[PDB]
Design a protein around this ligand. Structure first.
Ligand code: NA
Length: 129
């Protein structure tokens, strides 16, 4: 599924991501925009052989099991395929653990390079939330 901006903002709120670990909803929507372009089916192969999955491009190196990332962990205790669902619950639950890991949203390199310090409120501007 390809969400609209305000539609994803609403789904993220419903799933308790708004202000989670102090990151406003705009921070989560901006991250999703540049990670997946709001596409829940996005997959991208990393040079190390890990894969990134879903709206927030969660990496098989640490967080999900895809069966093909040697030496990896599965800290969200999920198949990486559950991160490709039109229902964002699994991606949200696993993003909550990632952002709690110590480096906040710097874990998403697209967030650090493209969202951090910007007017992230623009991402939720005019949304009925
Ligand atoms: Na893994």
């Amino acid at each position: 599924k390809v969400f609209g901006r305000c539609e994803l903002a609403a789904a993220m709120k419903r799933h308790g991501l708004d202000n989670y670990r102090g990151y406003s909803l705009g921070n989560w929507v901006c991250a999703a925009k540049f990670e997946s372009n709001f596409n829940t089916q996005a997959t991208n192969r990393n040079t190390d052989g890990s894969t990134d999955y879903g709206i927030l491009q969660i990496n098989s190196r640490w967080w999900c099991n895809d069966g093909r990332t040697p030496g990896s962990r599965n800290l969200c205790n999920i198949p990486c395929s559950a991160l490709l669902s039109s229902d964002i619950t699994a991606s949200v639950n696993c993003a909550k653990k990632i952002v709690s890991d110590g480096n906040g949203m710097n874990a998403w390199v697209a967030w650090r390079n493209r969202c951090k310090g910007t007017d992230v409120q623009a991402w939720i501007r005019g949304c009925r939330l």
